[PDB]
């Protein structure tokens, strides 16, 4: 049909579509029709709802009338004020995911969550030294994560001057940030402020609300993610390269079938775990599964990725998707990005949705909380309910469309340094002789306003084969992972300079660099390189993109992005075109502020063209001549 | 003109509106009415723009499209997740306003704040060891202080399992928050926690999003105020009762009139400081003038009636007329509340617009950046260009309208108990015996939908006549004070018990307990009282108001109020309408869950009769006539 491969670029994704239609299942491209067209005002950023002597509408009319709110503020204070607190959202999400590892950490410290543990100790020992722990080297390993908690804590506190991980970004950048006020000091502490920032008749500057907008999200990606990435790593296990598979044949019909959904690895590690109790798999074996087959959705897919191999169903579009097939026993969700959609559609089936989250309830969910101090007790439970449900799985309603394909992942920095014989040398030597022209890391999201996947694949094709080296993360690994880009052998794909340093160091062009929070990789590495060099990160021929985004959290990464001189791409535009010089700030003004800017694209062609161009002018300001 | 009258019940706003009118200024009232009608979908709160998948609308069609945004939310969960952003707003207003107070106590305490002390030091003293400093009683004061400012930063931290000035709510009440999940836990955590809860894909139960709503305002209420309102005592002297004047009038031709705006006192008091240096007051004098006139707008105009009896020009809606007097040489503003129509209407005069805070930025103002090191510096520059500018001010367009109307002001809880003898038992003895029924909080704001202060005063006059006290904050103070409610001698105003009372006393029937922040002193008041007498703040004869609110701010101060167990009116509705659900638990639901519930009316008659029928239900609920 016509209208469903209008949708996705994706057979798994065509065969759900043809099913959910027969079994009057809507889906979020039904609903996406229906709210089309959107309220002009609200697609604009024209609207303000931050008090009731509102709510009020800017128009532009030769008359003057509504040209300001019933406060004054006009469109521009209105549309930043907007995209402020936009931003805010995403950077909490990330806020509280990273907070809920440090209490995770803290509760390992201190002998409190049975099955959890210090699995990288070198790693825990080495972010202690960095971050200023006392003997972090010798000290007893609790003692040191102790240590380690006070000062992630400490971050999300108001006393400093700067987040701890900053120190990590050339002098140079952090020198601007000071003089800029972008300085990321407390990752609540940003997002308190913007939103005092956005209150009737506090900051009524739009420049000053986007640069608060920027410190806001830098507090994101320095801090909140990057607390979440390096804690995830200490308590779960630096990624390593591993081979898994990928799309909705993942799914077994002969296998209880737990699908976890959201963000974060504390509860998806935990009910892996309890899936391999002994007790448990009896349990499943005597309801006449052959297996209990664990697999990942979204971010926290991701994560069971990168540090487990688990096989990942799909990305934000095919979560709907997953339980049309007919075989999801159930689904165990957290936090961010499950749509509530999935509650209704369960209920079309035998499925059990699971929420775990106080922050995470769904009304009509099954709620099974959980905590460091009881999650191994309660994730058995969790499985043992989706054993349960197996036993109810209609027969006739499984259609599981596709095979997997197979994907390599697990490119964190560590990894790629051992890929690279321990120092980032050989990849600096790459760059400088051509072979790798620049970085883009392709990140975010799918958007029911774009072909599932269409702009996120052409254009990791479009930048590999300019001999541009793909970073891929967030719902981006499974469109790159379903194109088949994210094996050794996608090196026949790339360019000539790119796919011989991909065979020489036997990786993709295309390197699984983590879930969301894990962005905070990237901006590890761009910090690394641009120290090495001696210059700032507006100086490294580096990019980003989010071709299909739709969250506050991308657009809270894009803005760390481009706050640290990352020039980054989106496919869409966020609600601000109705101010005219908020979007001339975005796209253009930023560039004189902090090294980099905003660029929206919706012809994933032309964006590759774009981000090649800012990587060919910062090849020149480096000097090179290859 | 008739629609002149209609827009405020006050002589002094005629006065200006009809000025405005005559020299083509528009002001709040008309960008009101080019705002009516309002966009439905965003009225009833059945619009979200969380995300571009949207922005999303829901609607009641025959077809049956649109009742779920693009992610599935249906209408309850975007309008709780809106109402739960509108708090959370509120909430931040308070949390960096406390936070400021914080910053210039360590400043203090490390000898880098000239011209800050502690102006309060046996109040230093004795919050310092009420949170558990040792030897509080005994150290040098600026140890004591440094000690009381990193147990205020640990508020503001993630480490916490309650916030350290709940201790003051009784035991019951703690124990209740604590098994609903609402104890708040750190200031600035659960503002964050409602933005992340408030993603797509979050918080999808409309119940859950109110309950952290709750907890959310309760870290307001019961910390970023209570934080602000205790440092602001300790940095610049607890108030006592003092004698002011309030309305247009306090503005003086003769004067260089610097009107203070906005909400810090930190600003506000080192501005009143310079005007008051030698040499200063010397060059306003060179220029011509009589002197220097420091006169108050909204809730830093409160902090300076309650500490230093400055005069309130006036509140919310009176601030754009302040300076359609043609009278005000500087306007001084640092955060929250400031319309930024004010820039625009200072252009069409002389008078110079200052900006102070990196968080209240507006352009086209003139920026003097204040911090506690460089405030005294700053401060004497700002009033050096209020002076320069007074020497062009164009005698032809100066109206100042009214005589001033006198207030009596200060009553903070330590003057309240002083009043007393030192025990709040003649208070409880009152209440036993009838003469005072109850007591009810009116705060907050003004707002166009209404007659300016119609409500506040019609409200304030019929508790007083029941025999219910009144606790006035805000912008209220100024609606109270402009109706003579202010003052010792108001109590011919009140019912017999009441004014027999208030003339033992020596006090009014209307007390001013000070700003938007210092509704945690009523907070503070109402957990002393339910702590005496083993009871919860939900079985006191209690209540709050605000008939004519406009702000985030206040929103969050009543839902802290509500979940306190206070029960709380507002004249307007907020912005919830849209879920018949969420609109059911706050007018209803509550009450089981937290012992008081929000009331919605617009006739403050009948607003009168349902927080008097609230008291009279709990006075029998404890056994009282
Ligand atoms: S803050 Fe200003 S623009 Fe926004 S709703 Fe209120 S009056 Fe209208
Ligand atoms: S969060 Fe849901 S309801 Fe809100 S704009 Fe996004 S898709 Fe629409
Ligand atoms: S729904 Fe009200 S302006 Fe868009
Ligand atoms: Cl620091
Ligand atoms: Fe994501
Ligand atoms: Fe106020
Ligand atoms: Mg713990
Ligand atoms: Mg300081
Ligand atoms: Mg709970």
């Not at 390269?241 to 990928?246: D, L």
Request: hydrophobic content about 45%.
């Amino acid at each position: 049909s016509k209208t469903i491969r209008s949708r996705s670029i994706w057979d798994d994704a065509h065969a759900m579509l043809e099913k959910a239609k027969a079994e009057g299942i809507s889906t979020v491209w039904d609903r996406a029709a229906e709210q089309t067209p959107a309220c002009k005002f609200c697609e604009l950023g024209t609207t303000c709802r931050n008090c009731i002597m509102g709510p009020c509408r800017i128009a532009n009319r030769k008359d003057g009338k509504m040209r300001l709110g019933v406060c004054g503020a006009d469109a521009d204070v209105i549309v930043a004020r907007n995209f402020g607190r936009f931003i805010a959202g995403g950077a909490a999400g990330h806020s509280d995911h990273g907070r809920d590892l440090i209490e995770t950490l803290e509760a390992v410290a201190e002998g409190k969550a049975p099955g959890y543990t210090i699995r990288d100790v070198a790693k825990l020992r080495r972010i202690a030294a960095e971050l200023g722990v006392a003997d972090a080297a010798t000290r007893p390993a609790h003692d040191v994560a102790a240590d380690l908690v006070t000062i992630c804590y400490n971050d999300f506190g108001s006393r400093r001057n700067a987040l701890a991980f900053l120190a990590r970004a050339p002098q140079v950048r952090r020198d601007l940030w000071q003089r800029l006020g972008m300085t990321p000091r407390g990752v609540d502490r940003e997002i308190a402020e913007m939103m005092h920032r956005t209150h009737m008749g506090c900051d009524n500057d739009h420049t000053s609300l986007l640069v608060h907008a920027a410190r806001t999200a830098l507090a994101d990606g320095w801090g909140g993610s990057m607390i979440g990435t390096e804690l995830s790593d200490i308590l779960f296990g630096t990624p390593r390269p591993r081979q898994s598979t990928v799309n909705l044949g993942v799914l077994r019909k002969d296998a209880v079938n737990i699908l976890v959904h959201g963000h974060n690895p504390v509860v998806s590690e935990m009910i892996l775990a309890a899936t391999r109790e002994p007790a448990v798999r009896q349990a499943a074996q005597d309801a006449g599964a052959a297996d209990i087959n664990v697999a990942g959705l979204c971010c926290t897919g991701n994560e069971l990725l990168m540090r487990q191999g688990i096989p990942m169903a799909g990305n934000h579009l095919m979560t709907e998707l997953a339980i049309v097939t007919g075989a999801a026993d159930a689904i165990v969700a957290d936090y961010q990005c499950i749509m509530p959609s999935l509650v209704q559609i369960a209920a079309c089936y035998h499925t059990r949705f699971v929420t775990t989250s106080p922050k995470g309830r769904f009304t009509g969910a099954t709620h099974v909380e959980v905590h460091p101090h009881n999650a191994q007790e309660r994730c058995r439970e969790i499985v043992m309910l989706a054993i349960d449900a197996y036993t109810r799985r209609d027969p006739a309603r499984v259609d599981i469309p596709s095979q997997p394909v197979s994907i390599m992942s697990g490119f964190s920095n560590e990894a790629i340094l051992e890929a690279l014989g321990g120092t980032p040398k050989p990849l600096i030597d790459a760059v400088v002789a051509g072979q790798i022209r620049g970085f883009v890391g392709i990140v975010g999201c799918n958007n029911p306003k774009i072909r599932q996947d269409s702009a996120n694949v052409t254009l990791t094709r479009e930048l590999i084969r300019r001999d541009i080296m793909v970073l891929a993360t967030g719902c981006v690994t499974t469109a790159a992972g379903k194109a088949g880009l994210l094996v050794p052998e996608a090196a026949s794909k790339a360019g000539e300079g790119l796919a011989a340093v991909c065979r020489s160091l036997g990786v993709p062009p295309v390197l699984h660099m983590g879930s969301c929070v894990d962005n905070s990789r990237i901006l590890q590495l761009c910090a690394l390189l641009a120290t090495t060099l001696g210059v700032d990160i507006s100086d490294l021929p580096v990019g980003a993109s989010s071709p299909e985004w739709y969250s506050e959290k991308a657009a809270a990464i894009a803005m760390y992005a481009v706050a640290s001189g990352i020039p980054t791409h989106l496919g869409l535009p966020p609600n601000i075109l109705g101010s005219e010089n908020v979007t001339a700030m975005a796209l253009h003004g930023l560039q004189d502020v902090v090294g980099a800017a905003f660029m929206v694209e919706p012809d994933p062609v032309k964006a590759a063209d774009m981000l090649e161009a800012h990587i060919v002018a910062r090849r020149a300001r480096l000097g090179l001549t290859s």
